[PDB]
Each structure stands twice: as C-alpha cells, then as structure tokens.
Design a protein around this ligand. Sequence first.
Ligand code: PO3
Lengths: 150, 77
Amino acid sequence: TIEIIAPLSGEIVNIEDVPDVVFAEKIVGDGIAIKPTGNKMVAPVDGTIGKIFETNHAFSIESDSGVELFVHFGIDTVELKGEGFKRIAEEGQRVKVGDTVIEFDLPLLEEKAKSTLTPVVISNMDEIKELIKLSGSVTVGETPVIRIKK
Amino acid sequence: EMAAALVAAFGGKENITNLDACITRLRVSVADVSKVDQAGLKKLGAAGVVVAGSGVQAIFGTKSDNLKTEMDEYIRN
Ligand SMILES: O=[P-]([O-])[O-]
C-alpha cells in the first residue's frame, strides 16, 4: 500500500467540487483537492520531480514506487504568470517526502487567483489497483491524503 | 504535424487570434466558431471540446502544454 502525503497544508476537498471540468471530470487523472492554509508545496512522495510549469505553480513527480502524481495550485493560476510563486526545486531533482518544491504567497493568491483549490491527482490511474481517498485537515509533508495499492 | 492539424481544426492559421493554455486545457481564439471542426478535434485525440464566447477550449490532457509550444512555433514559423 502506498501512502501519498499532503503536498501542502489545508482541508481535503472532493475533486468533483473543483471549479474546472477537466479536473472535476478527472480527465487529467483522479485524486483529491486541498484548500490551502500554508505557504509551500512539498514532495508528497519520495521520487523524482518530472516537470515544473514555467509559471512555477504546478509540478509533476514520479514516486520510486512507480506512481505519477500531478500537483496544480489553484485554478487557472497560470494567468498570474508566476506572481506569488517561487520555484525552489529543479526538474529532475530527486526528492524525499516533505522536500520543498515551491513556496507561494497565500494572501496574494487568495486575492488574485480565481480559486486556490489545489488538485493532487494520479495520472497513472491505469496502473493502480485501488485509490482510497482520505478526509479531514492535513499538515504539509506529514498527513497522508490518499492510500493506493499495486 | 499534429500542430498543423490542430490549426486547421480551429479554421486556419489566420483564424487564430490568440494562443494560451493552462495545465490540462488549451485555449485558442477563433474569428468564426462555425469554422472550428469539433469532429476534427475529437479525432486528434481531444478528450472533449468546450466553447466560451469567441474563445475555444480543447482538452488534450496534461500534454496540452506540449501542443501550445508546438502550435506557437508552427504558427510563428
Ligand atoms: O489546468 P490549469 O492550469 O487550470
């Protein structure tokens, strides 16, 4: 069983309640969303960063266990052109759970972003036996948000 | 080439008035929405098509950003 640890602090939310049909319809994969309350996004698993958006607001990471995750901070946040985010890690960087990948300005994003809801989905759905979504509040790099098998 | 096909599906290179996207959605502006080939987008592997005002959105998945880079180069070259 693989435990996906919270990439940021906040409250878990249903991915179907995200104001974006591609995420809500899980076209980009399945997982959960998090209403953020902290100031940084860390690695939810031990693996390798794959790609960091040029606007430094979303990234891809592959766990050593073979799971591909995708973290997207807020909705339509690319329109902010990087304002409020600071890439701390590099693409291809090997990381351990909790390593910081990006730090953000919550108050500035809460005021300018259409929504700070942050989807954390698995783009590897066809390679996992089961996805158990958890509930409640999480603490960055500490509280598990999803449990997967095979 | 898929980029050229995407441009044709929107109507043509001159029918594109703007290019932009996010992580899983591609936004292409079109002068006439009646010239967008919704069926053509589906065959290109688009997961779905959404039109808002004069802006047209196509769901290519996470690789949507790849189409943006290829279309930007092909449309500018
Ligand atoms: O997928 P996105 O950048 O709203």
